[PDB]
């Protein structure tokens, strides 16, 4: 257990939006629990909840990341992805993005999204590594309402391997 967020304290902590979307810790909705992190007012597929995790981790290591997701409005099914945003040498114009996992969710049902990931070594100059959830990429002109549904995440966990 290197990092855990279950939201049961009601705290947003260091979670943040990627763009103009809205994050809220809600009560009465959670994965086998009363609280979770809702992302709404999404207007791009890449809007979604993000948190910096590099400080929790040993550079060079392999770790297992998992989280639970759920959505409860719009289409009968929808894909959610779990991804990493990486920064090197504090260069914010050349961020890297890598999807680590994706699953099809059924409306109203919690599902686990997980994978092993690699934490780059110190000598790479890695300066940020953030996990985030999103829907599959579409260019801004092609985005539809089903792509920008609000969704919940909960029980975010990173474990040693
Ligand atoms: Ca919870």
């Amino acid at each position: 257990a290197l990092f855990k967020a279950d939201f049961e304290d009601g705290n947003i902590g260091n979670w943040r939006a990627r763009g103009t979307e809205k994050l809220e810790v809600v009560s009465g909705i959670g994965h086998n629990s009363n609280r979770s992190l809702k992302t709404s007012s999404r207007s791009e597929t890449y809007h979604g909840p993000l948190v910096e995790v590099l400080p929790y981790l040993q550079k060079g290591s392999t770790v297992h990341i998992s989280f639970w997701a759920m959505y409860d409005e719009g289409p009968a099914t929808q894909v959610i992805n779990g991804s990493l945003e990486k920064e090197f040498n504090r260069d914010t114009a050349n961020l890297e993005y890598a999807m680590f996992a994706s699953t099809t969710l059924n409306k109203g049902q919690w599902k686990k999204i997980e994978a092993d990931i690699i934490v780059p070594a110190e000598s790479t100059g890695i300066s940020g590594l953030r996990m985030y959830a999103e829907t599959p990429w579409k260019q801004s002109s092609e985005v539809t309402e089903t792509d920008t549904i609000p969704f919940y995440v909960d029980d975010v966990q990173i474990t040693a391997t």
Side-chain angles (χ1 to χ4, degrees), residues 25-138:
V25 178
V26 297
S27 72
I29 297 287
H31 175 60
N32 302 156
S33 65
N34 200 48
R35 300 206 189 194
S36 64
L37 176 63
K38 190 182 194 180
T39 304
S40 62
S41 288
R42 300 172 67 236
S43 58
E44 305 293 342
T45 57
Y46 58 82
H47 292 173
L50 177 147
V51 67
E52 173 73 66
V53 302
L54 190 55
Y56 293 96
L57 308 180
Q58 182 176 7
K59 292 170 186 159
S61 65
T62 297
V63 300
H64 190 76
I65 300 192
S66 56
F67 66 99
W68 290 78
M70 183 270 284
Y71 77 97
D72 66 10
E73 68 179 66
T77 64
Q78 174 59 54
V79 171
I80 294 291
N81 294 343
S83 295
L84 306 178
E85 175 177 286
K86 294 187 265 189
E87 184 196 272
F88 295 85
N89 308 121
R90 306 186 181 280
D91 183 356
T92 61
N94 286 296
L95 302 180
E96 295 184 12
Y97 309 98
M99 187 189 319
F100 63 80
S102 65
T103 77
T104 297
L105 283 74
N106 303 121
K107 186 159 134 186
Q109 93 152 345
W110 290 89
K111 196 157 167 184
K112 193 178 192 173
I113 291 92
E114 68 184 314
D116 281 0
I117 60 141
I118 281 151
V119 187
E122 176 66 31
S123 48
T124 64
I126 186 87
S127 58
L129 190 162
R130 307 114 190 195
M131 60 175 301
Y132 69 101
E134 64 179 343
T135 49
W137 174 276
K138 306 213 181 166

